[PDB]
Amino acid sequence: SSIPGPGYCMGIGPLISHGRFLWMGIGSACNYYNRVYGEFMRVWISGEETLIISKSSSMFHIMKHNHYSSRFGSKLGLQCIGMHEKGIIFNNNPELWKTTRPFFMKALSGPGLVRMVTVCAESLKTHLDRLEEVTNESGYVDVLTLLRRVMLDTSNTLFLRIPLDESAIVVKIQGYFDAWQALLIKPDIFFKISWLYKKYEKSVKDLKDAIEVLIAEKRRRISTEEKLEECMDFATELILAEKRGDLTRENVNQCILEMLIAAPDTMSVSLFFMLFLIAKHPNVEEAIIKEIQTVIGERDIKIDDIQKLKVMENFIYESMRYQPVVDLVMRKALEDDVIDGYPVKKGTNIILNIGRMHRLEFFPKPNEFTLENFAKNVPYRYFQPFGFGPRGCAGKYIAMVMMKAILVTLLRRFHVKTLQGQCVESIQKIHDLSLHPDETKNMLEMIFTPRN
Numbered sequence: 001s002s003i004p005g006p007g008y009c010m011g012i013g014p015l016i017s018h019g020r021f022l023w024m025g026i027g028s029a030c031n032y033y034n035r036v037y038g039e040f041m042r043v044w045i046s047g048e049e050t051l052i053i054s055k056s057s058s059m060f061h062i063m064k065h066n067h068y069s070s071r072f073g074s075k076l077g078l079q080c081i082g083m084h085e086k087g088i089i090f091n092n093n094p095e096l097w098k099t100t101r102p103f104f105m106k107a108l109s110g111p112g113l114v115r116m117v118t119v120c121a122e123s124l125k126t127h128l129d130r131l132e133e134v135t136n137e138s139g140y141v142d143v144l145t146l147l148r149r150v151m152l153d154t155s156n157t158l159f160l161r162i163p164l165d166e167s168a169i170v171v172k173i174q175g176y177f178d179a180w181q182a183l184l185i186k187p188d189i190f191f192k193i194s195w196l197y198k199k200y201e202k203s204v205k206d207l208k209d210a211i212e213v214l215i216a217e218k219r220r221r222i223s224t225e226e227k228l229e230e231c232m233d234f235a236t237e238l239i240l241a242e243k244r245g246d247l248t249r250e251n252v253n254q255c256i257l258e259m260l261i262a263a264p265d266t267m268s269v270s271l272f273f274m275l276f277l278i279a280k281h282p283n284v285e286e287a288i289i290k291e292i293q294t295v296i297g298e299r300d301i302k303i304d305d306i307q308k309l310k311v312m313e314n315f316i317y318e319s320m321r322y323q324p325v326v327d328l329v330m331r332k333a334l335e336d337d338v339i340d341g342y343p344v345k346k347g348t349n350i351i352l353n354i355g356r357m358h359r360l361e362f363f364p365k366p367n368e369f370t371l372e373n374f375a376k377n378v379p380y381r382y383f384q385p386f387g388f389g390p391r392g393c394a395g396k397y398i399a400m401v402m403m404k405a406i407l408v409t410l411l412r413r414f415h416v417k418t419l420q421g422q423c424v425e426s427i428q429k430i431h432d433l434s435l436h437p438d439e440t441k442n443m444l445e446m447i448f449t450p451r452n
């Protein structure tokens with residue numbers, strides 16, 4: 001069929017398009033190029049050719065097959081934040097990624113997902129008898145920060161369990177993301193002129209140095225053991241594998257960082273959106289509270305319960321569909337293939353625009369937020385909010401729990417209000433790596449007026 005896209009104006013194309021991404025934001029550039037051209041088209045980030053697809057069929061083909069299990073980005077930028085052949089999130093070494101994913105995959109399922117539902121509860125309760133830490137004089141709560149802390153506290157108690165200063169680590173995790181996001185696709189010229197990224201180089205060191213202190217104490221606590229396999233958290237599983245010879249110490253320290261930042265990074269921003277959604281849809285928030293009484297009463301939340309919270313389940317899915325945080329997935333082709341009649345050479349970067357695809361395909365009322373879109377059991381081949389196949393979200397299951405749980409325990413106890421005219425749509429957003437609130441603008445606060 002040959003590939004839709006802008007002109008390769010003899011080396012001018014690649015410069016305008018890359019340049020567009022840097023000015024626009026990886027997020028919006030895709031939403032732009034999809035709109036103007038096809039729902040499948042070619043652009044250039046650095047030299048390398050790169051597809052951007054919002055066709056459900058292409059999307060599904062990609063995430064399904066094993067020869068797409070790699071992402072992409074500046075080898076200089078990934079090296080700088082420490083994810084260059086080290087993490088899993090952006091680990092592009094297919095063998096070295098292959099042997100690391102199992103560790104995440106194990107810790108984020110089975111007994112840990114059972115532990116989580118209650119670890120999430122107790123770790124949110126603690127912080128809700130502590131609003132003094134987050135609340136304005138005028139009653140305004142700093143929802144974002146609150147969430148990040150309970151998210152990081154949750155991640156700690158499950159995967160690492162070593163005493164730390166939430167307050168301080170959160171600000172650092174932010175700096176790390178800020179940097180990661182800044183450097184993911186900066187062209188190499190950028191890295192020569194060094195006084196131009198020293199900020200980002202210092203935000204990385206901050207978090208890394210703060211965590212090397214944490215893993216150092218975690219190592220002591222295993223070398224003086226109360227009989228080993230009694231308490232096998234993610235962090236240990238790794239350290240024990242290192243002291244076999246499967247992982248580099250360096251490689252371990254990244255997974256433990258990548259395992260910590262993940263939830264605060266994304267769950268906080270996601271739940272925050274769902275909160276401006278519950279606060280502007282009274283019809284919905286009533287359905288949820290009733291469902292919570294029907295199923296739980298004022299008992300504690302337990303694993304057996306989560307399947308029953310069906311209306312909330314549809315709320316999370318509809319909030320993620322209508323107002324996503326992770327709206328695009330970056331993959332890369334490893335073997336050549338034809339996909340939807342188009343040829344795609346190995347080495348071709350891919351950006352799946354799942355955020356646009358959730359408005360162009362399947363759904364009945366795509367452009368309005370309604371629990372109506374999920375009244376008819378969604379095929380999952382038309383709604384991929386986590387991804388799937390050999391490189392889907394590793395947290396994809398645990399997350400669905402944690403949201404359910406922290407949404408329950410919150411709504412269970414507070415009515416939520418949005419300062420003045422504000423709402424998800426009127427909120428000002430940055431559309432770069434993710435799709436998150438612009439934190440330098442204000443009016444992002446909420447008001448937690450009690451209940452019953």
Ligand code: HEM
Binds near residue numbers: 326385
């Ligand atoms: C609801 C919030 C979340 C959303 C929307 C989300 C979404 C995603 C998406 C779309 C991907 C890319 C998968 C693909 O390429 O198809 C991803 C990757 C990943 N996610 Fe999440 N995720 C969420 C929560 C979490 C949580 C709570 C964790 C663990 C703390 C987590 C851990 C990971 C990891 C480790 C990867 C990289 C997997 C790999 O490339 O090998 N995620 N996530």
Ligand SMILES: CC#CCO[C@@H]1C[C@@H]2[C@H](CC[C@]3(C)C(=O)CC[C@@H]23)[C@@]2(C)C=CC(=O)C=C12
Binds near residue numbers: 261263265435
């Ligand atoms: C604030 C905020 C936020 C959430 O988005 C980021 C970036 C995610 C990335 C997975 C791979 C993803 C989906 C990609 O392939 C491109 C963007 C990537 C994701 C979701 C995973 C963990 C994390 O800490 C941070 C993120």
